[PDB]
Chain A
Amino acid sequence: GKCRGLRTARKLRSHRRDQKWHDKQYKKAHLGTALKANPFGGASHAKGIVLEKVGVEAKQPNSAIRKCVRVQLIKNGKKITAFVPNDGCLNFIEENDEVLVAGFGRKGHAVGDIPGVRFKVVKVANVSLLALYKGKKERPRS
């Protein structure tokens, strides 16, 4: 069992320090590799340029074509796949547009049936996807 002597504060402190590296929640935030590898670089959002529109096949047991875009982030040049939510929102997006991208809500993990997509589009052409979807504003037509 664990040591309990009155002079074991160092041993108990040292052991908890070592064993704290063995849960991925701590090692993700305290190693630095995760932050370096993070496409957003520790940011909640990131801007980028739509390289192309791509369709992702939904995982079994579902069947659908999830609409996404390949985006190259401005701040670091990394390439990510961002899901485009809602029914006809992919039509608003065109090639080589500035898009504000956010996370999918699972802190760096895929959400639902879309395989390997960890990001979603919030604004396109500096106008919100929701306001476009709800008819508040229109794709900056020049």
Chain B
Amino acid sequence: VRMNVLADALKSINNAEKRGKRQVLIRPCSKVIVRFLTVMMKHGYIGEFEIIDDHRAGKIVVNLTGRLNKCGVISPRFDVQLKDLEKWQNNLLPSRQFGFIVLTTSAGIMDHEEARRKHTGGKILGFFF
């Protein structure tokens, strides 16, 4: 069955991105999905998206700007300490110049650079570059 809504969403965005589509329908929708999408929006990797209310899990339509190279999930959500964050960056990101690791921390869902600034480790959610 569907064990991970975030994995389904990020994979669906990744496939439409590679296919040159301008919009992608994401189903079902979760707070973790919306917070993950927001992190990509604040960095410009995706355009506006509209959550659609169906009195159910929800559906989303994301506008794609042709900027994502890959938005991948990490399963399982490993615990990431601040000291081990650098070794995760060297393994998941093409370079330090760009690309982000999305962390769920007690402070909130945030990218790896904001977590380093707020001195909070957390559980890894995914990445994009």
Contact = CB atoms under 8 A, between A and B. Distances in A.
- The prevalent SS among residues of B at the interface is loop
Contacts of B77: 6
Interface string A103-131: 00000000000000000000000000000
A5 interface: yes
Contacts, number: 6
Q: Contact residue range for chain B?
A: under 10
Q: Contact residue range for chain A?
A: under 10
A4 B74 CA distance: 10
Contacts of A6: 76-78
A5 B78 CA distance: 10
A11 B102 CA distance: 28
Interface in B50-109: 75-78
Interface string A1-23: 00011100000000000000000
6 contacts: A4-B75, A4-B76, A5-B76, A6-B76, A6-B77, A6-B78
Interface of B: 75-78
Interface of A: 4-6
